[PDB]
Amino acid sequence: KTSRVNRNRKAPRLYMKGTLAGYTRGLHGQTKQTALVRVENVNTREDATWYVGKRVCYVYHGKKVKRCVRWSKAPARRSTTRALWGRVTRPHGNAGMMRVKFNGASVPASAIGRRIRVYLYPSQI
């Protein structure tokens, strides 16, 4: 028969698949409070400035279904999955790194090597 295609129409993604390289640091050790993020295709320090100010999300799950946003406006949305939030504050090096500043409490360290969401908002264009 006429062959179909896996043409992948699903709920789109408006994020970039960042990932915590680690934390800012020297040889003297580590300074948390400022994370580093590799985004794909962001590799020139003049396109990692396009992200300065973009909200950034470390998605993780706990073990309990704690409260969250719209806990009652959307009881379907409540889950064991949480999210942290920061904003790209600055580039880092000249190869598309970027410094992320998570809101208050820094990002944990079960987050290194694991996925970060660099959303396109707040847009700038």
- The piece of 16-24, 26-34, 58-66, 82-90 that touches another protein (CB under 8 A) is 16-24
Question: Which ranges in 3-106 belong to alpha helices (H)?
Answer: none
How many of the other CB atoms lie within 10 Å of CB of 22? Answer: 14
Given 47, 59, 108, 120, the residue binding RNA (CB under 7 A): 59
First to last CA, the chain: 47
Distance CA(117)–CA(81), nearest Å, equals 14
CB contact burial 51-89 (16+ within 10 A = b; e otherwise): beebbbbbebeeeeeeeeeeeeeeeeeeeeeeebebbbb
Residue 108 interacts with, from another protein, RNA, Mg ion, none (CB under 5-8 Å by kind): none
Residues 23-42 that bind another protein (CB under 8 A): 38, 40-42
Task: Specify the residue, 51 or 102, whose C-beta has the smaller distance to another protein.
Answer: 51
- Please report how close the Cβ of residue 34 comes to another protein at its closest, in angstroms: 18
- Please report how close the Cβ of residue 11 comes to RNA at its closest, in angstroms: 3
- Please report how close the Cβ of residue 104 comes to another protein at its closest, in angstroms: 21
